[PDB]
Amino acid sequence: VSFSVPGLVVEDMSNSRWPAQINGLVVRGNEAQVVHFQNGRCTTEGTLLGTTTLSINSICGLRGLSVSQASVDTTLWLRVEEPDGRPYDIFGDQPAPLGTPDFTAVIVGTAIRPRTASGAYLHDAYVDTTPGDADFTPSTGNTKIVLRGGGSGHVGQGHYWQFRPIAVEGGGSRPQYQEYNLPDYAGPTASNHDLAPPVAPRMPGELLLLFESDMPVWDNGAGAAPAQKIHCLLPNEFITHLFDLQAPALAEAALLRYVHPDSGRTLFECKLYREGYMVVAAPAGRLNFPLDGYFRFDSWVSAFYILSPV
Amino acid sequence: VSFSVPGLVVEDMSNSRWPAQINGLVVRGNEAQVVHFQNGRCTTEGTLLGTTTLSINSICGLRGLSVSQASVDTTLWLRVEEPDGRPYDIFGDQPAPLGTPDFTAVIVGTAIRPRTASGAYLHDAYVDTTPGDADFTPSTGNTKIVLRGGGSGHVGQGHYWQFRPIAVEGGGSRPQYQEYNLPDYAGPTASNHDLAPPVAPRMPGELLLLFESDMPVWDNGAGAAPAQKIHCLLPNEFITHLFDLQAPALAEAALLRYVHPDSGRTLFECKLYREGYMVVAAPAGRLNFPLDGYFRFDSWVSAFYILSPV
Structure with missing residues (x-):
C-alpha cells in the first residue's frame, strides 16, 4: 500500500x-x-x-454514565467510557479514555445529558485537570465535572453525559x-x-x-x-x-x-x-x-x- | 482516478x-x-x-468582524465572512457563507472573540435563524448574534468573532x-x-x-x-x-x-x-x-x- x-x-x-x-x-x-x-x-x-x-x-472531552458521589455549584460524577460507548479498559494500553484532555488547565465547557427520556438537559460546566483537583482520575475510571452555578437535581445516577470543551480559564487568580x-x-x-x-x-x-x-x-x-x-x-x-x-x-x-x-x-x-x-x-x-x-x-x-x- | x-x-x-x-x-x-x-x-x-x-x-456557525448596528441581553453584529478568513462573495454561487446554519431554530452557542489584544472574550449566545428574526441575513453580508444576559461594552466594531453551536432551544413557548x-x-x-x-x-x-x-x-x-x-x-x-x-x-x-x-x-x-x-x-x-x-x-x-x- x-x-x-x-x-x-x-x-x-x-x-x-x-x-x-x-x-x-x-x-x-x-x-x-x-x-x-x-x-x-x-x-x-x-x-x-x-x-x-x-x-x-x-476530542478533549469526557463522557459516560452519571454515578453517585458516594460510589466514588453542583458536582457531576461520571463512569468514564470510550467515544463509541464501549467500556474504558482500566488495565489496558491507554493512559485514559480516548479523547481525554491531555493537558493541565481548568477547561470550561458544556455538560450535556442528551438522550434522557425525562427530558434532555445541558449546563455550563468545567473540568479541573490540574493536580489541584484530586477528583480528576480518568485512569481509574471516574472524573468530576463541575456544573457552574446550577445543576442540583439533574445529576442523578444512571444517565449518559458528555463534557464538551469550549475554552480554558485565564486571569491572575485562576489556574x-x-x-x-x-x-x-x-x-x-x-x-x-x-x-x-x-x-x-x-x-x-x-x-x-x-x-x-x-x-x-x-x-x-x-x-x-x-x-x-x-x-x-x-x-x-x-x-x-x-x-x-x-x-x-x-x-x-x-x-x-x-x-x-x-x-x-x-x-x-x-x-x-x-x-x-x-x-x-x-x-x-x-x-x-x-x-x-x-x-x-x-x-x-x-x-x-x-x-x-x- | x-x-x-x-x-x-x-x-x-x-x-x-x-x-x-x-x-x-x-x-x-x-x-x-x-x-x-x-x-x-x-x-x-x-x-x-x-x-x-x-x-x-x-459547520453550522457564523464568523467575521464585528460592526456597528447603525451601519446595518446585548446584540452583536457581524460582517460575515468565510471560514478561511476571506470575504463572502455576495453575488457569488452560494446562498450564504460556508458553514452557515441550514435550518430554522434558535441555535444556542458561544460567541467567541479569541484574538483581541485588549483581552480575549467569550459569552453565552444564541442565533435565531427563523423567519421571526429579520436580522438573520447572511446572504446580504450581516447577521445578528444575541449575547444572553451580558455583553455590554464587548461588542465594539473592528474585532474578529465566531459563533460556535452547542444546542437548539426546546420547550413549548420557544421557537x-x-x-x-x-x-x-x-x-x-x-x-x-x-x-x-x-x-x-x-x-x-x-x-x-x-x-x-x-x-x-x-x-x-x-x-x-x-x-x-x-x-x-x-x-x-x-x-x-x-x-x-x-x-x-x-x-x-x-x-x-x-x-x-x-x-x-x-x-x-x-x-x-x-x-x-x-x-x-x-x-x-x-x-x-x-x-x-x-x-x-x-x-x-x-x-x-x-x-x-x-
Missing part, C-alpha cells in the same frame, strides 16, 4: 487536540517542556497512540493553562501509564513544526485575559488519512512539500517522521506562509536527509 | 451539519418536507455544493427546531439563491439513508424539553475523502456494502448516487445495525440496479 498524505489545504484542516480550525504554522524549539501530547498521535503507518480518537467531536504539561490521569496519589512517547527531534538543525489554533479563554466576562493558542503534531485529516491507508513506512521519514497553487510553486519542505511528527530546517517561531497550501509526499527519506531551509 | 470511500467505521465519523459523532443510521421516507440540506453536500466526484465546508469546526426547514438567508424581505438541489430518491422502493446524531437541547435549566436528533447525508470524513480524490463518476451510483468484521460478513448494501446521497431498499425507520462497521465500494451501477432488501 503506497504512502500518501491528504492534498487538503491547511486552513481547511482541524486541530487534533482541540475543537478548532488550524490558523497557523509555528516552529517550536527543543524547550525544557518536552512535547508529550496524548491526543493527535498517529504514526505514518496509521497506528494510533495514547488517547487518540478518530472521533473529532470526542494556568499549560498545554505541554500532562495531567495526573490517576490523580495525585497514583502514576500514569501507557503514555505515548515524548516527541523530541534527534537531528541537529531540525525543529518541530506544529499546527496552531486559537484557544478561547474564559475569565468570567471580564474580557481582560491574554489570548491563547493550542498546538498539535498532525491535523485530524492527516490522522484519519493515515489510519485508513495503513501504508508501511519504507524509511525513517516522509519528505513532504508544502505546495501553494497561487504561487505556482513549492514554498518549503518538511520531514514527517514515522513516529508521527513534522520537522523543518528553521528557527523557532511563526512560519509566515499562506495557509491555502497543502502538503505533498514526494519521497521516502533517511533521517540524515538534509532539508532545505524554510 | 479510481473511486473509493473511507474504510472508517460509522461510530468514528462525524455529522456534516452539526458538531457530533454519528450514533445512528435511519431511513427516511418521501415526506412532505423534502431534504434540502445546504451543508454536508458533496458529489461522488468531490464537488462541494451549497454552503458545504471542509472545515469541520466551522421550534426544524432541521429539514431552510431559513431565509436574505431575511424575510428577499429571496434565497444558488441553493444546493433538493434530495429525493427517484427509483421505486429506494429510500434515503441518513446519518443520525444526538442534538443537544437548551430549555433554560428546566431539563423538561424532549430530546432531539439531527441528520446528514454523508459524514464529513466521506466529504473530505471524495474532495481529495476527485474521482470521475463512471455511473449514476456507487454500489457500497456495509461490512461488519465481528460478523465476518456484509450486513447490507446501499447505493451512493453521484449527487451525494445514499439509498437503501428498506422501509422508513431506524436501522438496527452495529455502527462498528464500514462502507466498501464494490461496483459502479446504474440507477436501475436492484438493491437487496436490508
Whole structure:
C-alpha cells in the first residue's frame, strides 16, 4: 500500500487536540517542556497512540454514565467510557479514555445529558485537570465535572453525559493553562501509564513544526485575559488519512512539500517522521506562509536527509 | 482516478451539519418536507455544493468582524465572512457563507472573540435563524448574534468573532427546531439563491439513508424539553475523502456494502448516487445495525440496479 498524505489545504484542516480550525504554522524549539501530547498521535503507518480518537467531536472531552458521589455549584460524577460507548479498559494500553484532555488547565465547557427520556438537559460546566483537583482520575475510571452555578437535581445516577470543551480559564487568580504539561490521569496519589512517547527531534538543525489554533479563554466576562493558542503534531485529516491507508513506512521519514497553487510553486519542505511528527530546517517561531497550501509526499527519506531551509 | 470511500467505521465519523459523532443510521421516507440540506453536500466526484465546508469546526456557525448596528441581553453584529478568513462573495454561487446554519431554530452557542489584544472574550449566545428574526441575513453580508444576559461594552466594531453551536432551544413557548426547514438567508424581505438541489430518491422502493446524531437541547435549566436528533447525508470524513480524490463518476451510483468484521460478513448494501446521497431498499425507520462497521465500494451501477432488501 503506497504512502500518501491528504492534498487538503491547511486552513481547511482541524486541530487534533482541540475543537478548532488550524490558523497557523509555528516552529517550536527543543524547550525544557518536552512535547508529550496524548491526543493527535498517529504514526505514518496509521497506528494510533495514547488517547487518540478518530472521533473529532470526542476530542478533549469526557463522557459516560452519571454515578453517585458516594460510589466514588453542583458536582457531576461520571463512569468514564470510550467515544463509541464501549467500556474504558482500566488495565489496558491507554493512559485514559480516548479523547481525554491531555493537558493541565481548568477547561470550561458544556455538560450535556442528551438522550434522557425525562427530558434532555445541558449546563455550563468545567473540568479541573490540574493536580489541584484530586477528583480528576480518568485512569481509574471516574472524573468530576463541575456544573457552574446550577445543576442540583439533574445529576442523578444512571444517565449518559458528555463534557464538551469550549475554552480554558485565564486571569491572575485562576489556574494556568499549560498545554505541554500532562495531567495526573490517576490523580495525585497514583502514576500514569501507557503514555505515548515524548516527541523530541534527534537531528541537529531540525525543529518541530506544529499546527496552531486559537484557544478561547474564559475569565468570567471580564474580557481582560491574554489570548491563547493550542498546538498539535498532525491535523485530524492527516490522522484519519493515515489510519485508513495503513501504508508501511519504507524509511525513517516522509519528505513532504508544502505546495501553494497561487504561487505556482513549492514554498518549503518538511520531514514527517514515522513516529508521527513534522520537522523543518528553521528557527523557532511563526512560519509566515499562506495557509491555502497543502502538503505533498514526494519521497521516502533517511533521517540524515538534509532539508532545505524554510 | 479510481473511486473509493473511507474504510472508517460509522461510530468514528462525524455529522456534516452539526458538531457530533454519528450514533445512528435511519431511513427516511418521501415526506412532505423534502431534504434540502445546504451543508454536508458533496458529489461522488468531490464537488462541494451549497454552503458545504471542509472545515469541520466551522459547520453550522457564523464568523467575521464585528460592526456597528447603525451601519446595518446585548446584540452583536457581524460582517460575515468565510471560514478561511476571506470575504463572502455576495453575488457569488452560494446562498450564504460556508458553514452557515441550514435550518430554522434558535441555535444556542458561544460567541467567541479569541484574538483581541485588549483581552480575549467569550459569552453565552444564541442565533435565531427563523423567519421571526429579520436580522438573520447572511446572504446580504450581516447577521445578528444575541449575547444572553451580558455583553455590554464587548461588542465594539473592528474585532474578529465566531459563533460556535452547542444546542437548539426546546420547550413549548420557544421557537421550534426544524432541521429539514431552510431559513431565509436574505431575511424575510428577499429571496434565497444558488441553493444546493433538493434530495429525493427517484427509483421505486429506494429510500434515503441518513446519518443520525444526538442534538443537544437548551430549555433554560428546566431539563423538561424532549430530546432531539439531527441528520446528514454523508459524514464529513466521506466529504473530505471524495474532495481529495476527485474521482470521475463512471455511473449514476456507487454500489457500497456495509461490512461488519465481528460478523465476518456484509450486513447490507446501499447505493451512493453521484449527487451525494445514499439509498437503501428498506422501509422508513431506524436501522438496527452495529455502527462498528464500514462502507466498501464494490461496483459502479446504474440507477436501475436492484438493491437487496436490508
